[PDB]
Design a protein around this ligand. Structure first.
Ligand SMILES: Nc1ncnc2c1ncn2[C@@H]1O[C@H](COP(=O)(O)OP(=O)(O)OP(=O)(O)O)[C@@H](O)[C@H]1O
Ligand SMILES: [Mg+2]
Ligand SMILES: [Mg+2]
Lengths: 20, 339
């Protein structure tokens, strides 16, 4: 499932802002 | 609507007066009891503090001037303070004091104890559509207000949406906020929320905020974002792909609103059309929404965080707690002279 694939991914935590 | 443009007309006047002549040096570091770190970041931390003479708790954002200069965020930081001290809206976090010393910039904001929407969203898993529409409505009203002031927000995400005691949203982090008439070109935001035109370095406008709204609404209702991966590049690839898939439990209304918001073509993206924000407000998904009771915060919130004391931090993750030194010499004086 998509949820399962998400929870197993590396970006389930708080996501940093970016800029460059 | 009639008292809406009347409202926004008066609000523009209040804003522009503060914009023209920003407040400065309205407090100092020794007036606050530093207690605990509520959130970490690139420039420094965001501590929970108590005002010595007031007793009130605030969230003090501390920015290492040298780190701001090093990451070339000078102008962005000057934007954030100047915009924050000038704006005023029920769903915006409020800047009480701003000041600086030899080493740091300080922004003292009202404390929002309910924690980030992010935390509650991840724990609960996902919000039902009525829950996600109570939140989305607040953001719609907030973007309408901000854009009318020619302000572009550029970092909407659950991490930057705090929940207050009455269950309402306070938008925080104006680090990428910018008053701009016309196009701008800065690559900034958060990967899962970047509009296609940002990624493709095209130059963009306030329509990137409405895209971000679509992404937010999707994440709140699906429990996960419409574009995720392990590396930002692969995220960008999915975003510029223009292909989105909705969960089976998504209502037909919700799907239609989101395809309109996650529209890659700026000529067909909701909020960026002739009728502007009212295309969104009059969508069937929002047919149940009373925009006025939302603003007045007369609705009843579907969730109210467990309260247990004025200086409670149970709705915030714990962080490591660093020194706080102030150099005996002034750092970066010229750069932050207007802060
Ligand atoms: N007014 C507030 N009340 C309570 N907590 C706050 C408040 N403002 C910020 N915080 C906490 O600090 C965290 C970081 O704040 P903020 O985004 O402003 O910092 P940042 O480090 O600039 O983040 P970013 O990586 O997006 O630049 C927020 O998630 C929240 O946890
Ligand atoms: Mg943030
Ligand atoms: Mg920030």
């Amino acid at each position: 499932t998509t949820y399962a694939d998400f929870i197993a991914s590396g970006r389930t935590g708080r996501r940093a802002s970016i800029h460059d | 609507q009639e008292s809406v443009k009347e409202f926004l007309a008066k609000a523009k006047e209040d804003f522009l007066k503060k914009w023209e002549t920003p407040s400065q040096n309205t407090a100092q570091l020794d007036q606050f009891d530093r207690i605990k770190t509520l959130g970490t970041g690139s420039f420094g931390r965001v501590m929970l503090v108590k005002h010595k003479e007031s007793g009130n708790h605030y969230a003090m954002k501390i920015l290492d001037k040298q780190k701001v200069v090093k990451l070339k965020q000078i102008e962005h930081t000057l934007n954030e303070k100047r915009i924050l001290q000038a704006v005023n809206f029920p769903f915006l976090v409020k800047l009480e004091f701003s000041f600086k010393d030899n080493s740091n910039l300080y922004m003292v904001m009202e404390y929002v104890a309910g924690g980030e929407m992010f935390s509650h969203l991840r724990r609960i898993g996902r919000f039902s559509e009525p829950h996600a529409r109570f939140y989305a409505a607040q953001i719609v009203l907030t973007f309408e207000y901000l854009h009318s002031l020619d302000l572009i927000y550029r970092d909407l995400k659950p991490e930057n949406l705090l929940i207050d005691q009455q269950g309402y949203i306070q938008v925080t982090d104006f680090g990428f906020a910018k008053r701009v008439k016309g196009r701008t070109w800065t690559l900034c935001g958060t990967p899962e929320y970047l509009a296609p035109e940002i990624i493709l370095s095209k130059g963009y406008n306030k329509a990137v905020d409405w895209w971000a709204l679509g992404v937010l609404i999707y994440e709140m209702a699906a429990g996960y974002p419409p574009f995720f991966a392990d590396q930002p590049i692969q995220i960008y690839e999915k975003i510029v792909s223009g292909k989105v898939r909705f969960p089976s439990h998504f209502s037909s209304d919700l799907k239609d609103l989101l395809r309109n918001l996650l529209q890659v073509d700026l000529t067909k993206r909701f909020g960026n059309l002739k009728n502007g924000v009212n295309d969104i407000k009059n969508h069937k998904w929002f047919a149940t929404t009373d925009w006025i009771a939302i603003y007045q915060r007369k609705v009843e919130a579907p969730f109210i965080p467990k309260f247990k004391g004025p200086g409670d931090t149970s709705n915030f993750d714990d962080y490591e707690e660093e020194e706080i030194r102030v150099s005996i010499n002034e750092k970066c004086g010229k750069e932050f002279t207007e802060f």
